[PDB]
Amino acid sequence: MAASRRLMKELEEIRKAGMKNFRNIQVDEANLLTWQGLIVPDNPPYDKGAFRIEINFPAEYPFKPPKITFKTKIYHPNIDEKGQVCLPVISAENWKPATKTDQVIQSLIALVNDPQPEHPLRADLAEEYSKDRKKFAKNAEEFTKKYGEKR
Amino acid sequence: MLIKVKTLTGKEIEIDIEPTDKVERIKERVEEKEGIPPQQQRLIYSGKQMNDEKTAADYKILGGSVLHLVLALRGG
Amino acid sequence: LKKLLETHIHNQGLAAIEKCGEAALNDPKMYVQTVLDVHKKYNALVMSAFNNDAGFVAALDKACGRFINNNAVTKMAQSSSKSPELLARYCDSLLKKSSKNPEEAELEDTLNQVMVVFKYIEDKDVFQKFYAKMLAKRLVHQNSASDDAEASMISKLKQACGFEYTSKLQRMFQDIGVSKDLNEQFKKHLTNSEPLDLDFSIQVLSSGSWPFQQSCTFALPSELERSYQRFTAFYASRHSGRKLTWLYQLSKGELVTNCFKNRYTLQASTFQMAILLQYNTEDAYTVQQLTDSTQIKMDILAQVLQILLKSKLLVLEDENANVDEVELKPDTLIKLYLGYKNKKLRVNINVEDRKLLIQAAIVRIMKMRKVLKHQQLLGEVLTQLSSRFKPRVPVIKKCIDILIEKEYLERVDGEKDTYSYLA
Amino acid sequence: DYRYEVLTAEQILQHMVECIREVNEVIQNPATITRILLSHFNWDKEKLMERYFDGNLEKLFAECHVIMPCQICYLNYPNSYFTGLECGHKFCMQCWSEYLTTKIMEEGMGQTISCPAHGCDILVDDNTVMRLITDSKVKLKYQHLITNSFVECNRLLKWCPAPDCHHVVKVQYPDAKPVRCKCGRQFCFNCGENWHDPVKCKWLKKWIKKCDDDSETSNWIAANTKECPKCHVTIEKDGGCNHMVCRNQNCKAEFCWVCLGPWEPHGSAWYNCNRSRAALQRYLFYCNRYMNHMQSLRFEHKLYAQVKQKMEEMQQHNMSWIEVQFLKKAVDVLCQCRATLMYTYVFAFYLKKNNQSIIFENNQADLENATEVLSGYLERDISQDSLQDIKQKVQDKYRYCESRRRVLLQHVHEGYEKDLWEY
Amino acid sequence: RFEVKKWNAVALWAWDIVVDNCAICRNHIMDLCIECQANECTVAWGVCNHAFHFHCISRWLKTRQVCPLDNREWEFQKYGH
Amino acid sequence: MQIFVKTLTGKTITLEVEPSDTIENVKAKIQDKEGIPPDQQRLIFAGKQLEDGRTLSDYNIQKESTLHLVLRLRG
Ligand SMILES: [Zn+2]
Ligand SMILES: [Zn+2]
Ligand SMILES: [Zn+2]
Ligand SMILES: [Zn+2]
Ligand SMILES: [Zn+2]
Ligand SMILES: [Zn+2]
Ligand SMILES: [Zn+2]
Ligand SMILES: [Zn+2]
Ligand SMILES: [Zn+2]
Secondary structure, eight states: OHHHHHHHHHHHHHHHHOOSSEEEEEEOTTTOSEEEEEEOOOSTTTTSSBEEEEEEOOSSOSSSOOEEEOOSOOOOTTOOTTOOOOOTTTSTTTOOTTOOHHHHHHHHHHHHHSOOTTSOSSHHHHHHHHHOHHHHHHHHHHHHHHHOBOO | OEEEEEOSSOOEEEEEOOTTOBHHHHHHHHHHHHOOOTTTOEEEETTEEOOTTOBTTTTTOOTTOBOOEEOOSOOO | OHHHHHHHHHHHHHHHHHTTTHHHHTOHHHHHHHHHHHHHHHHHHHHHTTTTOHHHHHHHHHHHHHHHHSSHHHHHHTSSTTHHHHHHHHHHHHHSOOSSOOOHHHHHHHHHHHHHHHHHOSOTTHHHHHHHHHHHHHHHTOOOSOHHHHHHHHHHHHHHHOTTTTHHHHHHHHHHHHHHHHHHHHHHHGGGTOOSSOEEEEEEEOSSSSOOOOOOOOOOOTTSHHHHHHHHHHHHHHSSSOOOEEEEEEEEEEOOOTTSSSOOOOOOBHHHHHHHHHTTSOSOOBHHHHHHHHOOOHHHHHHHHHHHHHTTTEEOSSSSOOTTTOOOOSSOBOEEOTTOOOSSSSOOOOOOHHHHHHHHHHHHHHHHSSSBOHHHHHHHHHHHTTTTOOOOHHHHHHHHHHHHHTTSEEEOTTOSSOEEEOO | OOOBOOBOHHHHHHHHHHHHHHHHHHHOOOHHHHHHHHHTTTSOHHHHHHHHSSSOSHHHHHHHTOOOBOTTTOOBOOGGGOBOOTTSOOBOHHHHHHHHHHHHHHTOOOSOOBOSSTTOOOBOOHHHHHHHOOOSHHHHHHHHHHHHHHHHHOSSOOBOOSSSOOOBOOBSSOOSOEEEOSSSOEEETTTOSBOOSSSOHHHHHHHHHTOSSSOSHHHHHHHHOEEOTTTOOEEOOOOSSSOOBOOSSSOOOBBOTTTOOBTTTTTTSSOOOOOOSHHHHHHHHHHHHHHHHHHHHHTHHHHHHHHHHHHHHHHHTTOOHHHHHHHHHHHHHHHHHHHHHHHHHHHHHSOOOOHHHHHHHHHHHHHHHHHHHHHHHHHHHTOSSOHHHHHHHHHHHHHHHHHHHHHHHHHHHHHHHHTOOOO | OOOOOEEEEEEEOOOSOSOOOOSSSOOOTTSOOTTTTOOOOOEEEETTSOEEEHHHHHHHHHHOOSOTTSSSOOOEEEOOO | OEEEEEETTEEEEEEEOOTTOBHHHHHHHHHHHTOOOTTSEEEEETTEEOOSSSBTTTTTOOSSOEEEEEEOOOO
């Protein structure tokens, strides 16, 4: 219940403030512990194409980390096709019960812009990205182009 | 006047001092019973390390108080 | 009726010896006699009244063990090894040759009783040590009551504890037997060698059996040399390879002192013979001059000189000096007393922070010379701590290892003993 | 000697405030700060002394982490409802209580509890933790966690391996010397196994991993788990980052799973991590002997019982108590000899054949045979009414067995001292 | 003057060896060997100036023909009595 | 009805448990006793892993038996 009281005010603040990186804050007003949102990057090749994210706030919030689920597919070395990201700001070893979810949002977006070929869950893809960066700026470009969304 | 210096394990030392007696002289007076050259010895009082060149009366010490003694195996 | 008897008999015997108190702690006779009396009385009690059932004898034996091993005499001298020592001392003081002649029957009976008191004690190794020591003494000094008695005691000890328990004593006894045999053969071989002026006799022991140490750095006088060399050459003849390490510290002879006025006949130890034979030529030697010729150690020379000076044969420059306590210096005269007189003849002139210091020195010398060898380090730390104390080499090695595991040094890679400075 | 001690949880907890007082005598800081600083240094007094007094402080304090509605529940409260650490952040006690409760009851992080606000790392002392929570079971859980941390982080303490002994063996310095901790168990303080007299610890580990006839989980552990380089705990991985972080109590050291090295350089800019015929026969012989002795040492209760039963039964047939006493002593020596022969075989496995090894493997066979003859004597030849010879036989046999095993131990230790074995 | 009429000395017998362990049974050289102890036991000397009990060195040479402190050839040089 | 768990720090401990109990409840008991969260533990017995599906009786866990504990670091 305290989760709901915190989330309603956080969501109201985010909506009132307005951001240049987060659109379409979709949320079920009844459950209110699940968020669906659309992010847009700027750096190539992920800039061409929009794509969506789903957040699942667990029951014991803000005293447990909110797990994030990455719904739409994307060609990123640090993202699984099932849509799982690591994002150390959320892992249970560092979650501090005062961080606003928008800080998680900027952390995730910075992850999107800047890859981490040294902490991969697609080993061969990351090795190749760290090998011949030039071509993947096009290889992921086609994948996002045919699998992104309208920005 | 009679003061004392305590080692880390817990052994007790009695030393008499004169007002003008210097820290290095006190280190020697320790060594004549402890066999530790003054480079290794350090003297501790009021949390602040006792400066090498100073005098025992500079810190306004009165007898009876313990000037806790600590070892240091580097000692420069 | 069993558990109760054990509690009564243990409690009764304990206070029986408490009464003597310290008087027993220096007189084994009363102690052993008291234990024997208590045991005899309650053995007689459970011998007839209780028909000698197993349980009651078990109670008697358990309680006797209990109150023999720990009791007042044990506690007062504060150990459990004061009862076997007292028993050994009683056995020795019984088998010695005193003025009284021991009757064979009563001797055998009393040894039989000592065997009982022995079989109750619980530490039968301390008893062997003490009995071996005393038997060695009274065999060497020819001071014994009856060889049949000695043989019987060893035999019953062997019966009660097995062949391995009493092997040293059996060898220690057969050695005196072989010595007695060999002396006769030396006398026979001596008919053709004409021994210079003396009656000679030797007792040749073994090495591992007897509890004796090597020697005390003695220089033989020329008076005995002919006999010494002749016997050693005779001994080397009858055996293949064997090395006699003579020990003069416990050996005795007889002087004749045909230089005074009334023809006395002294009787003293070999150290006395060395010193008094020294004064054959002159009478103005000092302690240094004596040690120049006899090579005896300072402390033993001082003891012997004091014991002689107690007698009126040798006198300091002072005449009334309390020679019992006045200690003398290397530049002190000794005068032969020419007028000595005894009321009779045949005189008998005889009687941690330290570890922290170790570590401090280790690190000091380490930072002085980073690389250096183990043995040289041992020498240098010994020099640095000479004015304080000489720690044992195992202790120094231990402290070295503790400092290694405390990360102030590490032995260099590839060598067992070479220490480099931890940075 | 080997000076050690035994405590319980309450004393091992109070000795912590004891050490805090000892250091704060000369530091002159509040207790919480002293506890934090000391806990960062694995509870070693002099290391803290030298690192605190070697120079600047503020670098150490940054190295030790010590120096209007709520931001958590978003509700308004009185100023009396705000509290926070000395870093400056301010929250409310409801959030404080729930945060600490969930942390120490669902995460197990007892000692390393940090400030809630984002980015902060100022950790929370003991007094604040006691001052905020209200439950009692939570408090006792926190105490248990910090006590376990204190034991495991320190290198002078060790829990007893017994399935329920709750005792720490506080010692002055570790040397693999056996100790006993009043629960009836004695163990090697350095490796945790039972006491192993001749053999070294590392060969015991190498042999006990593949003991080959008792356990199989060691095979799994070797085939599917590495060990943390820092805290040495068996870890099984089922993630994919390869960026492992040791989630122990206080071993929060992150590393690389494959190379098992530090992660700071590794994967940062450019570094990338990526028995035929004689042996099994020798192992068969040695393991056969070792397993036989293990079986016999497991049945030691039955041996005591059977000798006791024959002991009583022989006593009732007109035989006294002292005989059966020697019988008990013989059994004791037999058990000790088997216990030593066990680890002697382990030592004699990892040993390259030279001259000084045929000597050893010829002595231990003889002691083996004598042990077997003694155990053969007992069972059958204590039959009846032949005491005066069987008693002699058994005593002669067990003294010989004890002497021999002492010789074996001395041989091994001399070889270690003189660098004479080769593997 | 002459002052000498009798003398009685005490001497210890011991084997003419420098070290005392027998290095086979590890017993003291003066004691009994390991087989005569589980119940005429002299000492033999090796051409390299090593000594052991007679029975110990007999078994050793029965199996392997090497002096067991110096892996060399062995031949008897002096018995003991 | 008791079994033995060999912890990471030596310190063998004994558990009270019924043959009908499940591995999840066993993990909860170990968590209550020691403090390790009951989701990075693996229990090993007889050289075969212990999953969460079946029970002690299914795995033929005897009485007065030992089963080891290892960490389950991931990510
Ligand atoms: Zn709050
Ligand atoms: Zn803070
Ligand atoms: Zn214990
Ligand atoms: Zn060990
Ligand atoms: Zn670790
Ligand atoms: Zn690696
Ligand atoms: Zn022999
Ligand atoms: Zn031999
Ligand atoms: Zn040789």
